Structure 1
Amino acid sequence: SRDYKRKYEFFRRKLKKQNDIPNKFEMKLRRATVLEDSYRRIMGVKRADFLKARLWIEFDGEKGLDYGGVAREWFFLISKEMFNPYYGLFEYSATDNYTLQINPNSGLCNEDHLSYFKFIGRVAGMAVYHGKLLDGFFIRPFYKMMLHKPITLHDMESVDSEYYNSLRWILENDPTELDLRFIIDEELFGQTHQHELKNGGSEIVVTNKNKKEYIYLVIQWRFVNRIQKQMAAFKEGFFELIPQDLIKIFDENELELLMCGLGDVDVNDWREHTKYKNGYSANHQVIQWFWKAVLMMDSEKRIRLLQFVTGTSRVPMNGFAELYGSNGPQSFTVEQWGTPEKLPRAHTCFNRLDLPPYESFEELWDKLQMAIENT
Structure 2
Amino acid sequence: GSREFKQKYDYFRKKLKKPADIPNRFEMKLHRNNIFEESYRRIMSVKRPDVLKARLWIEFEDYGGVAREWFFLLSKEMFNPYYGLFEYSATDNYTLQINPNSGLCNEDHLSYFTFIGRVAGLAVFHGKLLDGFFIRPFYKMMLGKQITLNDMESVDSEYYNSLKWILENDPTELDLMFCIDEENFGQTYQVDLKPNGSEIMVTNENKREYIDLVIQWRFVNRVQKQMNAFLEGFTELLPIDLIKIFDENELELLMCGLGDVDVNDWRQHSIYKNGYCPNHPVIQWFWKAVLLMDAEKRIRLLQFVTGTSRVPMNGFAELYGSNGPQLFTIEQWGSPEKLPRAHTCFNRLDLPPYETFEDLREKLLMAVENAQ
Percent identity for Structure 1 against Structure 2 = 69
- State the TM-score, normalized to the length of structure 2: 0.75
2:137 matched to 1:136? no
In structure 1, runs of 5+ residues without a counterpart are 61-65, 268-278, 311-342, 346-354
> Which residue pairs with 2:253 in the alignment?
257
What is the CA–CA distance in structure 2 between the aligned matches of 1:76 and 1:306, rounded to whole Å?
Answer: 7
2:76 matched to 1:80? yes
- The superposition leaves residues 291-318 of structure 1 with CA deviations (integer Å, 9 ceiling, x where unpaired) of 23454531694994997489xxxxxxxx
> Which residue pairs with 2:37 in the alignment?
36
Deviation at 1:252, TM superposition (A): 1.2
**Quick one: which amino acid aligns to residue 30 of structure 2?**
L
- State the TM-score, normalized to the length of structure 1: 0.74
> Which residue pairs with 2:227 in the alignment?
231
Deviates more, 1:137-146 or 1:5-14: 5-14
Deviates more, 1:116-125 or 1:32-41: 32-41
Deviation at 1:135, TM superposition (A): 1.2
- The superposition leaves residues 333-374 of structure 1 with CA deviations (integer Å, 9 ceiling, x where unpaired) of xxxxxxxxxx989xxxxxxxxx99x867969999x9679xxx
What is the CA–CA distance in structure 1 between the aligned matches of 2:258 and 2:287, rounded to whole Å?
Answer: 22
> Which residue pairs with 1:181 in the alignment?
177
Within 5 Å, give how 1:291-330 maps onto structure 2. Answer: 291-293=288-290, 295=293, 297-298=298-299, 301=302, 304=311, 308=315
- The superposition leaves residues 122-156 of structure 1 with CA deviations (integer Å, 9 ceiling, x where unpaired) of 00011111111101110001110111111111111
Within 5 Å, give how 1:54-69 maps onto structure 2. Answer: 54-60=55-61, 66-69=62-65
**Quick one: which amino acid aligns to residue 116 of structure 2?**
I
What is the CA–CA distance in structure 2 between the aligned matches of 1:236 and 1:221, rounded to whole Å?
Answer: 22
Deviates more, 1:6-15 or 1:99-108: 6-15
What is the CA–CA distance in structure 1 between the aligned matches of 2:24 and 2:100, rounded to whole Å?
Answer: 39
Is contact 2:202-2:210 (8 Å) kept? yes
Q: Partner of 2:97: helix, strand, or coil? A: strand
Is contact 1:106-1:113 (8 Å) kept? yes
Give the superposed CA RMSD: 3.4
Is contact 1:185-1:195 (8 Å) kept? yes
Q: Partner of 2:69: helix, strand, or coil? A: helix
Of 96, 99, 109, which aligns to 1:100?
96
> Which residue pairs with 1:330 in the alignment?
none
**Quick one: which amino acid aligns to residue 26 of structure 1?**
E
Q: Partner of 1:185: helix, strand, or coil? A: strand
Tell me the matched-pair count. Answer: 315
What is the CA–CA distance in structure 2 between the aligned matches of 1:70 and 1:304, rounded to whole Å?
Answer: 18
What is the CA–CA distance in structure 1 between the aligned matches of 2:172 and 2:11, rounded to whole Å?
Answer: 51
What is the CA–CA distance in structure 1 between the aligned matches of 2:64 and 2:311, rounded to whole Å?
Answer: 22
Distance 1:280-1:55 versus aligned 2 partners, 3 A rule: closer
Q: Partner of 1:298: helix, strand, or coil? A: helix
Deviation at 1:53, TM superposition (A): 0.2
> Which residue pairs with 1:47 in the alignment?
48
Deviation at 1:188, TM superposition (A): 4.9
**Quick one: which amino acid aligns to residue 223 of structure 1?**
F
2:173 matched to 1:172? no
Q: Partner of 1:199: helix, strand, or coil? A: coil
Is contact 1:49-1:241 (8 Å) kept? yes
Q: Partner of 1:225: helix, strand, or coil? A: coil
> Which residue pairs with 1:290 in the alignment?
287
Q: Partner of 1:226: helix, strand, or coil? A: coil
**Quick one: which amino acid aligns to residue 241 of structure 2?**
D
Deviation at 1:266, TM superposition (A): 11
Deviation at 1:185, TM superposition (A): 1.2
